[PDB]
Ligand binder design. Structure first.
Ligand SMILES: Nc1ncnc2c1ncn2[C@@H]1O[C@H](COP(=O)(O)OP(=O)(O)OP(=O)(O)O)[C@@H](O)[C@H]1O
Ligand SMILES: Nc1ncnc2c1ncn2[C@@H]1O[C@H](COP(=O)(O)OP(=O)(O)OP(=O)(O)O)[C@@H](O)[C@H]1O
Ligand SMILES: Nc1ncnc2c1ncn2[C@@H]1O[C@H](COP(=O)(O)OP(=O)(O)OP(=O)(O)O)[C@@H](O)[C@H]1O
Ligand SMILES: Nc1ncnc2c1ncn2[C@@H]1O[C@H](COP(=O)(O)OP(=O)(O)OP(=O)(O)O)[C@@H](O)[C@H]1O
Lengths: 578, 367, 379
């Protein structure tokens, strides 16, 4: 035992193991179990990071501090490192001699408790031959006879998958469920532990820093439990603050440092909103109007959703915003979204919904159910939002997906979550959801029969309503109708496309000038309300790019020249040059 | 009592030692009593306390603060969910019976199907119930169980398969939290094979997982929500008089959930549409949420009564429930505030006054 | 990678569970950073807190190698940890840290490297820097919750274009030394820009570097015939083009005439329908000229008409004339809605999941190709 276990009273008394705060009921049972006539061995079972070891060792602390029932007073708790019982072995029989020697020592002390953490690891030692499991074979009678007292500890999952197969062991200890504290209990736990962080990091925490670490961690960090989750924030903020005095920036850790740390851990930005990001955001609405012409209202809706979220007036558990972009083809429905993600500097997660035409294609978004082929793959959607929690999520031509696929978004739009096939949750609260569609267009573009042409603008009233179930629609922030582009827009579109052409040419060392007459001509020639801005690229392709490709490819316009294009008036034909 | 209670509440061990353990812990417990110098014998009440602790169930509520918490549970919920009183009452009645002891031998605390128009707090009330009671909410978006084979994610892969150690997500959630509110959202979206899992739960309080262990739902409140019948509810009839289609919505529910399912529910509660009175309450609720969000930035907010009356009058839509009201709040209050909070006077300001004129019915703003 | 290290240091500086885990896509510099810190410590490019501390890199294979008998592994494992605990100013670094979870427990037991490490991380006794990909982190580290709680995940993203150029400028001298080459400024900038435009299934820090290394390696085989030269933008372009399959610079050579005469080689084979020939010929020329569509296909043209008029023959002849692969897809075989899974594959969990997807594999194998969809109206 001398070099296999740790005397926890000795440790708790001299170095300290950090105080245990609260957990009155947890200890009440542990003691009542330890006080039983037989099988007086509690097992602390729970979610990782809830204080299972904190309690098991915390008991040693209470004993050395005298804060125990006299029954427990003066008893010694020893923690066993089973790794050391194997490190000292090699051939047959040495393990058992060593293992039993420790048991004899516990029996001889008579007033001691052994603590075995990771209790599910006591299964082992036997190998090659085996059948002698250690875990049960060397201790079943020790536990059932009351000769020794053992406190164990385990993760709830390990407990059911491993620590629960051996019924004989399952029967020999009393399980105590350690659940995670609530907000207040977490705050008091921090206050009790706080002096150790302040002492370790040479920092001090404000009342708000502590209050906030708990509330913020709960809201933003969701893969850990409260008592160790809020601590990471406090400890991390401490470690960060400790790196300031290096430039003499000695300071108290305040709520501002906590928010910076939570924001970094959760990858959700929070303080830059007060800095230059105010202008990046302020100007967002206009940068996008230089890329998508017309459609200002779509730009505003996106811009507004983002501003509210950055302002802090977002929702508590919804995507940044979620609206469907409907309209005629070639009007900037996907273009504004692509540009939004560029303007914001964030990842664009683009899915083509045309690929999800069968009901069973949902498995590509979620992953196969356990037990199936594609299980370890995970889901493509849930994974995309996990790697990039701050993103623009674009679902192109959503009306092409099998309609049951839309059901996947009900919980996304409403709770910001989606659960993958491993049970992990996607978190969409920092994702802008944009879905585009051509629903209703075929109808809006149809001519009616009669003397008076009917106004078919109520496409929203039929196709959008028939396609998207009421519960889907009632979760959208908006349904935004993109219009056909006007001729004023076409002129802007043509200018835009010519610039794109100029850039491709600049990269080849040549440049292009187009006269205004030539531009107006191309705009006038290509406009077709029905196809939006889509054909303008073809008009440019035929009137400017084809001529240029011949000049670029066969030597007429290569190194040494530039091309000027002008329109004549007689034929309205374009000129070219060098 | 140790013997007859252990067989009812402790189900992972055989009786000899299972009952002795109750006796032994009760013994140890009583042994730790005369430290206060109060000598004890072990009565039925001490046995019941031990079983309650071993089985992870509630003991006796009348002398507890739980008595008061339970007594006015309906009142607190009515402050969060307006209207739909009958749903609130059904939930609290089932709970009271269970704590009263007038429960079921082997069934969930109660089992309800929440049906009705959208935007009505079918989900909202369940979420608040778990908060009001202080217990874990176990959620399961049923839209994610659309294929016959998705059942294995609820109960785990069969042994020997790639998803065998993961276990089931449902049985594990229940095992970890035996006393909980279990919410199954949009249950009608799940593949019907899923309902077969629910039928046995509703009748026995239990599911066997892929490890052969059982989840005990005896202390779980089971609420599942649905939109079955909504498209029909919102349909307008042909004629001069619009018809009440709630009767057809039920026909839709009865086609999705077969008699075998329906007979295992304690109730099917058809939630009604929200009234204008409710909207006024809803608007105040949303404004308060806004005020809280603003307080977090150090900004106070006043909204006049007329501004409230107007927002409520503007946003009400009987068919869409309360969800649109939040849209009204975003456009009339949050957007203006975001600009002031982000680029203007409220950054280090801290105050905003909102009222409207009568001539334009436009809102005021500013520090 | 200043911020990536700032966080790593802040994690190492924590009181407990001060073990950063570097998680990211492959080829993004995760291990470059962990080794980079050892480099910075030695060079004095780190806070005094890290200064003078030793980072050791663990060979899991040598730790497990030879551990026969019951107890040798456990002994070696513990000896290592003891040595680290007695150093007091060291950090252990583990590549592919998810593999520690698979350390050899001898038999049916659970005593292995992860179970033996856990208490020393919780206690703050030792410091470990881990490294794993987002996929290995998800399928391995994410599952062992207790171990995962002892690491602080650092999210390492792919660098920008400007950042990639800068790492090349820093790394460059070693490629120059290794290959006996020198790289021009244009060569470096282009490796990054071109790799971004043309090389898929890789991340920048690696993608640009791979081009620099190969181009250096190409030039390394020139002064064997004493064709000594530097690596210019043209050489970088050639290397990327090897992968991209359509060079932007060779278009200026004999390729100009191969392309110029394309229209006539096709007119002599397909008669009438000159307009189809022109449509195809022009699309290619623009694409080779550089007047492409940035992200769209070379061109997409529906050929409609009476039978026996050369609609598929001209496309077949095009692929022949160009010297490129013809990918054929008979649309009549996709006569039903569900037949789409033949083109892209079955969803995960379904029979045939690992069979592939005919269209996506055809295109992936042959990036430069003519894709012909016969009788599209029959799909
Ligand atoms: N009363 C408490 N005493 C000590 N620690 C507590 C307490 N309550 C919560 N904690 C938190 O839990 C941790 C205490 O250590 P503990 O051994 O209990 O972890 P754990 O719950 O067993 O997690 P794991 O399964 O990974 O070992 C600390 O992060 C601490 O912030
Ligand atoms: N308002 C606009 N300003 C400038 N260019 C535009 C505009 N609208 C469309 N375009 C042009 O069309 C493209 C933008 O993509 P767009 O949003 O129109 O796709 P879409 O609306 O989804 O149509 P589809 O039905 O084919 O998917 C760009 O090439 C862009 O030059
Ligand atoms: N009776 C109510 N009182 C106040 N707010 C309500 C009420 N009912 C609904 N709401 C509003 O709805 C919001 C939550 O939506 P809810 O949970 O009710 O949708 P649902 O019941 O699931 O219906 P569906 O999903 O079919 O659209 C609440 O935050 C609340 O603002
Ligand atoms: N314009 C042409 N000039 C010379 N030969 C030709 C022409 N068209 C077709 N042919 C010949 O006739 C045969 C059929 O040609 P092809 O398959 O390309 O026509 P198609 O448009 O595909 O008809 P289908 O409607 O059946 O698909 C080929 O062997 C081809 O050599």
């Amino acid at each position: 035992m001398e070099n296999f276990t740790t005397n926890l009273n000795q440790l708790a008394r001299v170095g300290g193991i950090d105080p245990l705060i609260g957990r009155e009921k947890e200890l009440e049972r542990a003691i009542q179990v330890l006080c039983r006539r037989r099988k007086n061995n509690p097992l602390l079972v729970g979610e990782s990071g809830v204080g299972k070891t904190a309690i098991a060792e915390g008991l040693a602390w209470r004993i050395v501090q005298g804060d125990v029932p006299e029954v427990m007073a003066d008893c010694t708790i020893y923690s066993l490192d089973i790794g050391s019982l194997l490190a000292g072995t090699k051939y047959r029989g040495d393990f058992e001699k060593r293992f039993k020697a420790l048991l004899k020592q516990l029996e001889q002390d008579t007033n001691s408790i052994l603590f075995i953490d990771e209790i599910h690891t006591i299964i082992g030692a036997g190998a090659a031959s085996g059948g002698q499991v250690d875990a049960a074979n060397l201790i079943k009678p020790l536990l059932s006879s009351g000769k020794i007292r053992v406190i164990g500890s385990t993760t709830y999952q390990e407990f059911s998958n491993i620590f629960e197969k051996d019924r004989a062991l399952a029967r020999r200890f009393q399980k105590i469920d350690i659940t995670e504290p609530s907000i207040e209990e977490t705050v008091q736990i921090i206050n009790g532990l706080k002096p150790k962080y302040e002492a370790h990091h040479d920092v001090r925490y404000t009342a708000k820093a502590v209050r906030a670490a708990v509330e913020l961690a709960v809201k933003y960090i969701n893969d850990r439990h409260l008592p160790d989750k809020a601590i990471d924030v406090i400890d991390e903020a401490g470690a960060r603050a400790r790196l300031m005095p290096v430039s003499k920036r000695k300071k108290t850790v305040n709520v501002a440092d906590i928010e910076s740390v939570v924001a970094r851990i959760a990858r959700i930005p929070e303080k830059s909103v007060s800095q230059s990001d105010r202008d990046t955001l302020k100007n967002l609405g206009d940068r996008l109007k230089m890329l998508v012409f017309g459609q200002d209202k779509a730009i505003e809706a996106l811009t507004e959703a983002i501003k509210m979220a950055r302002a802090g007036l977002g929702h508590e558990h919804k995507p940044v915003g979620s609206f469907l972009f409907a309209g005629p083809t070639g009007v900037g429905k996907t273009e504004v979204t692509v540009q939004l993600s560029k303007a914001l500097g964030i990842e664009l997660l683009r899915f083509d919904m045309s690929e999800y035409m069968e009901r069973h294609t949902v498995s590509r978004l979620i992953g196969a159910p356990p037990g199936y082929v594609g299980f370890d793959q995970g889901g493509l959607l849930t994974d995309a939002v996990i790697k990039h929690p701050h993103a623009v999520l674009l679902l192109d031509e959503i009306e092409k997906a099998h309609p049951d696929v839309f059901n996947i978004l009900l919980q996304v739009m409403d709770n910001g979550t989606l659960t993958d096939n491993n049970g992990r949750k996607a978190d969409f609260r920092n994702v802008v959801l944009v879905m585009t569609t051509n629903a209703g267009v075929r109808e809006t573009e149809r001519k009616s029969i009669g003397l008076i042409h009917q106004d078919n603008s109520t496409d929203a009233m039929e196709e959008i309503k028939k396609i998207f179930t009421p519960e889907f629609r009632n979760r959208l922030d908006n349904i935004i109708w993109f219009d056909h582009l006007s001729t004023d827009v076409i002129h802007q579109v043509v200018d835009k496309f010519i610039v794109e052409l100029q850039v491709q040419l600049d990269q080849k060392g040549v440049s292009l000038e187009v006269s205004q007459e030539a531009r107006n001509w191309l705009a006038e020639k290509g406009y077709d309300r029905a196809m939006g801005a889509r054909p303008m690229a073809r008009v440019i392709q035929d009137n400017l790019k084809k001529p240029l490709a011949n000049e670029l490819l066969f030597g007429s316009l290569v190194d040494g020249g530039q091309v000027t294009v002008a329109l004549d008036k007689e034929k309205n034909e374009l000129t070219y040059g060098f």
